[PDB]
Design a protein around this nucleic acid. Structure first.
Ligand code: ZN
Ligand code: ZN
Lengths: 121, 121
RNA sequence: GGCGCGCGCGCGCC
RNA sequence: GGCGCGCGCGCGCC
């Protein structure tokens, strides 16, 4: 499907394109590349936890000046440390139309969901 | 689906039975008979209104003096002056067992919902 | 995160 | 009464 842009629900800054998105265990979403790294800052999770395949360690936020909108978490997965985002904190913008959409749950946003991959990393 | 007793949620007093209840226009619950009239007291309605075919004429409360728990309102439905109750002010007691259930909305409470019938007065 | 839920206050309509 | 919604707090498992 059409590649799309995820912008902070709050400031509207560009976070990533679904192109760089990956799915884990069909329900957890993360973003590839250092580029996405410069886009958020993480911070010690007040109530870390271990569930399924992760150790929820940090809480992440939009890395821009006066927004710091909670974008989700940062976790240890296998031997990787990675961000796991929640579609609710972003706005999906269609590239060829500008149309924007607010999703609350990932199941509702139907785009090409490529499973997370070790090889790539 | 059996006959249950309705009890004032706050003081536990007997208000009425489910066999006496009747549903007006699928959303409002009144009570037939004199017994139920010996159970509540009416008082001026703080801010009368007028929704659909009803007109708020008063607030009704549990009769037991030391209780006075709000049970709902009293309205004019067509040519009738009748009490309209909200299950949330009551405790539904199963007659055989004593088992009591707290509901906040009438839709969640499943029993034989006999419709208001003018013939019955 | 994902899933589900509880609570507090605010608003509108019939 | 009944229904729809907004904002914010918290809980559980996995
Ligand atoms: Zn932002
Ligand atoms: Zn009472």
């Amino acid at each position: 499907k059409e590649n799309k842009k995820l912008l902070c629900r709050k400031c509207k800054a560009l976070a990533c394109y679904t192109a760089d998105v990956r799915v884990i265990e069909e329900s957890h979403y993360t973003v590839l590349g250092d580029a996405f790294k410069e886009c958020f800052v993480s911070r010690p999770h007040p109530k870390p936890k271990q569930f399924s395949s992760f150790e929820k360690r940090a809480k992440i936020f939009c890395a821009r000046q006066n927004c710091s909108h909670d974008w989700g978490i940062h976790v240890k997965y296998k031997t990787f440390e990675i961000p796991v985002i929640k579609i609710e904190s972003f706005v999906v913008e269609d590239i060829a139309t500008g149309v924007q959409t607010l999703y609350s749950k990932w199941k509702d946003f139907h785009f090409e969901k490529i499973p997370f991959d070790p090889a790539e990393m």
